[PDB]
Amino acid sequence: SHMVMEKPSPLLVGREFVRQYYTLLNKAPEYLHRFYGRNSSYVHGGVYGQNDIHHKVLSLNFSECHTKIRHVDAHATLSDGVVVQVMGLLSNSGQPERKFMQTFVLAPEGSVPNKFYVHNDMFRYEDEVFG
Template sequence: MASNGNFAQQDQFKEPADQQQTAPATSAADGSATAAAASNSNLSKDEVGWYFVEQYYTTLSKSPEKLHLFYGKRSQFVYGLEAELANVSVGRQAIQERIKDLDFQDCKVRVSNVDSQASFDNIVIQVIGETSNKAAEPKKFVQTFVLAQQPSGYFVLNDILRYIDEESDDESAAAPEETAEETAAPAVEEEAAPVEPEAPQSVEETNDET
């Protein structure tokens, strides 16, 4: 898995052994969505971001009914397909209703890339991976989080998830190949038969008898 840090790969398509969460950055176990790790001055913002990703997708997989606890009153949540016009859910209650509509059951996540950056007091995180719901075929997704500080930790201020349309990518990749083949093998026009000059008519001499 690619990353800009030491984040361990998340692969929930294979059932992982239960591991003790040593220092999660945020927690959905209480209503404030905070944790001791976020207030620990020994952790960098990058480390907080990595712990958050692990905690978030573990909650999505095992306790989706608690996922809304990562958000606050000012949070914004967008979830949709690529190029789809998706509504923005604002506030924890609206996000909770949206999550219920998504009906997460037996959700599995495989994270392939995590990038995390500090942005003033916030943390910006981008996740690329695959997810499946209700044992369906996995779909590629890109999810971007902004974690904002609060007195005892962080909460999710912004969350945007888009599923990637892989069929469109395949079609786009195939189009240049077809064009290249057409360029490499141009149509050969039949050459016109050469025009041969006609033989001059013989001129017969006539003797006029006088």
């Protein structure tokens, strides 16, 4: 029983990504599109293409967005990718906290080497789905 040297642990890649993702969302939301490729999908309910994602984020207007991460779980998936499920609270522009469930699919960048990009991003508010 030894540690895998070839690939980074999926759980650490997910947690570190979530940490940086929501941090940048609070700081500079306009640079958030740099996490996605020209084939990624962004859904914030409430889109395929990085340029469409950039315009999508700006249309949401994130002004000092604070996030309380309640749960994060990340596993390894297809083609050495990482799938992450995130549950927590979201408060944007002074509005009160809203329970959400955001899921990511972290894909390894082409080359090289240990670089990842968001291949899938699905965001859903709880009060809009259940009530």
